[PDB]
Design an enzyme around this catalytic site. Structure first.
Site, PDB file in Angstrom:
ATOM      1  N   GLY A   1      -0.283   2.560  -5.649  1.00  0.00           N
ATOM      2  CA  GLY A   1      -1.536   1.844  -5.517  1.00  0.00           C
ATOM      3  C   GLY A   1      -1.855   1.299  -4.131  1.00  0.00           C
ATOM      4  O   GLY A   1      -1.607   1.908  -3.114  1.00  0.00           O
TER       5      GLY A   1
ATOM      6  N   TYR B   1      -8.142   8.834   2.608  1.00  0.00           N
ATOM      7  CA  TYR B   1      -8.360   9.773   1.516  1.00  0.00           C
ATOM      8  C   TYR B   1      -9.534   9.397   0.651  1.00  0.00           C
ATOM      9  O   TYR B   1     -10.141  10.243  -0.017  1.00  0.00           O
ATOM     10  CB  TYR B   1      -7.147   9.798   0.610  1.00  0.00           C
ATOM     11  CG  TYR B   1      -6.148  10.824   1.051  1.00  0.00           C
ATOM     12  CD1 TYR B   1      -5.292  10.568   2.116  1.00  0.00           C
ATOM     13  CD2 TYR B   1      -6.128  12.063   0.418  1.00  0.00           C
ATOM     14  CE1 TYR B   1      -4.377  11.537   2.519  1.00  0.00           C
ATOM     15  CE2 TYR B   1      -5.213  13.040   0.796  1.00  0.00           C
ATOM     16  CZ  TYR B   1      -4.336  12.749   1.838  1.00  0.00           C
ATOM     17  OH  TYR B   1      -3.408  13.686   2.178  1.00  0.00           O
TER      18      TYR B   1
ATOM     19  N   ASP C   1      -3.326  12.723   7.133  1.00  0.00           N
ATOM     20  CA  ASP C   1      -1.881  12.855   7.116  1.00  0.00           C
ATOM     21  C   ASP C   1      -1.259  12.734   8.490  1.00  0.00           C
ATOM     22  O   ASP C   1      -0.243  12.053   8.676  1.00  0.00           O
ATOM     23  CB  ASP C   1      -1.369  14.162   6.432  1.00  0.00           C
ATOM     24  CG  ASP C   1      -1.603  14.238   4.941  1.00  0.00           C
ATOM     25  OD1 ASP C   1      -2.045  13.175   4.464  1.00  0.00           O
ATOM     26  OD2 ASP C   1      -1.401  15.250   4.258  1.00  0.00           O
TER      27      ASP C   1
ATOM     28  N   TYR D   1       0.756  -1.225   0.000  1.00  0.00           N
ATOM     29  CA  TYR D   1       0.000   0.000   0.000  1.00  0.00           C
ATOM     30  C   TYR D   1       0.791   1.282   0.000  1.00  0.00           C
ATOM     31  O   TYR D   1       0.305   2.344  -0.375  1.00  0.00           O
ATOM     32  CB  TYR D   1      -0.936  -0.033   1.223  1.00  0.00           C
ATOM     33  CG  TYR D   1      -2.053  -1.035   0.953  1.00  0.00           C
ATOM     34  CD1 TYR D   1      -1.888  -2.401   1.186  1.00  0.00           C
ATOM     35  CD2 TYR D   1      -3.260  -0.583   0.422  1.00  0.00           C
ATOM     36  CE1 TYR D   1      -2.888  -3.323   0.871  1.00  0.00           C
ATOM     37  CE2 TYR D   1      -4.263  -1.495   0.116  1.00  0.00           C
ATOM     38  CZ  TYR D   1      -4.077  -2.864   0.306  1.00  0.00           C
ATOM     39  OH  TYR D   1      -5.089  -3.745  -0.060  1.00  0.00           O
TER      40      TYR D   1
ATOM     41  N   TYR E   1      -3.244  22.660   3.551  1.00  0.00           N
ATOM     42  CA  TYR E   1      -3.983  22.932   4.783  1.00  0.00           C
ATOM     43  C   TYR E   1      -3.033  23.700   5.682  1.00  0.00           C
ATOM     44  O   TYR E   1      -1.958  24.095   5.204  1.00  0.00           O
ATOM     45  CB  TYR E   1      -4.593  21.681   5.475  1.00  0.00           C
ATOM     46  CG  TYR E   1      -3.633  20.520   5.466  1.00  0.00           C
ATOM     47  CD1 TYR E   1      -2.492  20.565   6.264  1.00  0.00           C
ATOM     48  CD2 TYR E   1      -3.776  19.397   4.643  1.00  0.00           C
ATOM     49  CE1 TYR E   1      -1.532  19.551   6.264  1.00  0.00           C
ATOM     50  CE2 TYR E   1      -2.842  18.354   4.622  1.00  0.00           C
ATOM     51  CZ  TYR E   1      -1.702  18.456   5.424  1.00  0.00           C
ATOM     52  OH  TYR E   1      -0.741  17.487   5.428  1.00  0.00           O
TER      53      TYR E   1
ATOM     54  N   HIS F   1      -4.167   5.074   5.445  1.00  0.00           N
ATOM     55  CA  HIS F   1      -4.071   6.425   4.899  1.00  0.00           C
ATOM     56  C   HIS F   1      -4.727   6.391   3.541  1.00  0.00           C
ATOM     57  O   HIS F   1      -5.374   7.379   3.164  1.00  0.00           O
ATOM     58  CB  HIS F   1      -2.573   6.832   4.797  1.00  0.00           C
ATOM     59  CG  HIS F   1      -2.279   8.221   4.320  1.00  0.00           C
ATOM     60  ND1 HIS F   1      -1.868   8.492   3.031  1.00  0.00           N
ATOM     61  CD2 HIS F   1      -2.296   9.424   4.973  1.00  0.00           C
ATOM     62  CE1 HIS F   1      -1.666   9.806   2.927  1.00  0.00           C
ATOM     63  NE2 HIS F   1      -1.927  10.410   4.084  1.00  0.00           N
ATOM     64  N   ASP F   2      -4.560   5.272   2.781  1.00  0.00           N
ATOM     65  CA  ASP F   2      -5.213   5.252   1.465  1.00  0.00           C
ATOM     66  C   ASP F   2      -6.723   5.312   1.566  1.00  0.00           C
ATOM     67  O   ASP F   2      -7.399   6.014   0.857  1.00  0.00           O
ATOM     68  CB  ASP F   2      -4.821   4.085   0.506  1.00  0.00           C
ATOM     69  CG  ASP F   2      -3.407   3.998  -0.011  1.00  0.00           C
ATOM     70  OD1 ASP F   2      -2.549   4.885   0.126  1.00  0.00           O
ATOM     71  OD2 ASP F   2      -3.178   2.916  -0.577  1.00  0.00           O
TER      72      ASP F   2
ATOM     73  N   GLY G   1       2.632   3.605  -1.653  1.00  0.00           N
ATOM     74  CA  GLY G   1       3.056   3.928  -2.992  1.00  0.00           C
ATOM     75  C   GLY G   1       1.786   4.204  -3.773  1.00  0.00           C
ATOM     76  O   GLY G   1       0.677   4.255  -3.221  1.00  0.00           O
TER      77      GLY G   1
HETATM   78 CA    CA Z   1      -1.085   3.661  -1.644  1.00  0.00          CA
HETATM   79 CA    CA Z   2      -6.426  25.126   1.548  1.00  0.00          CA
END
Ligand code: CA
Ligand code: CA
Ligand code: CA
Lengths: 124, 124
Positions: free
Chosen positions: B32, B52, B99, B28, B73, B48-49, B30
């Site tokens: 993909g 998002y 993040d 994961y 941000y 994290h993938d 990277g």
């Molecule tokens: Ca990934």
């Molecule tokens: Ca912004």
């Protein structure tokens, strides 16, 4: 981001229809900009165009932001006054500012219906 | 924005080289993500993938936010602690959190040098 800029114009100019009123007006209000601006409102668009070009030269905008028209910043509309959040990052604060100044600019410029949809190959 | 996530990783793991150490690790971390994550660090990438992916389905992000890997941000690094600034809108706050949790995740997972550059075709 562009959606914020449309909302700032409704803030400063209540009852305005931003896309309908200011897009494709004179030589600068719209996708490009060339030639001599044809009135004070066009000059507002010309400064906003240069404002965005200058923002792109900042180091902060280079590492953090890809597209200014899509980047969201923090601002508020109080009554008829626009305020850019002091806690915006340096790239976001610069964009917010360009937009805020254009909006205030459009609110004081006279609108010339004749300049709307002006032929940009002919006059610009 | 991606530059900010790289920066938060160096906040939490002082002296790491984010691209060099964490890109192309397990299944994961990277471009993909498919298959079963190979270890805890890889499960951080996987979370994290998905983070998002959820961010995108958030209304304020949904339509109003181009791409979450692009949106900048506000955050700050104090010593080794990461803080997402309260000025952030729902979209940006959500991103900053995805993040922040991944960088903290990475700081705690064990690193198997043997999973760096794992053949994704073969093992995922
Ligand atoms: Ca990934
Ligand atoms: Ca912004
Ligand atoms: Ca223009």
């Amino acid at each position: 981001a562009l959606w914020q800029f449309r909302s700032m114009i409704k803030c400063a100019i209540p009852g305005s229809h931003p896309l309908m009123d200011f897009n494709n007006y004179g030589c600068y209000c719209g996708l490009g900009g060339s030639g001599t601006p044809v009135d004070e409102l066009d000059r507002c668009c010309e400064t906003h165009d240069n404002c965005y070009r200058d923002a792109k030269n900042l180091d902060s905008c280079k590492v953090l932001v890809d597209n200014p028209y899509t980047e969201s910043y923090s601002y508020s509309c109080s009554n008829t006054e626009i305020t850019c959040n002091s806690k915006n990052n340096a790239c976001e604060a610069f964009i917010c500012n360009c937009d805020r100044n254009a909006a205030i600019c459009f609110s004081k410029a006279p609108y010339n219906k004749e300049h709307k949809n002006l032929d940009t190959k002919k006059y610009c």
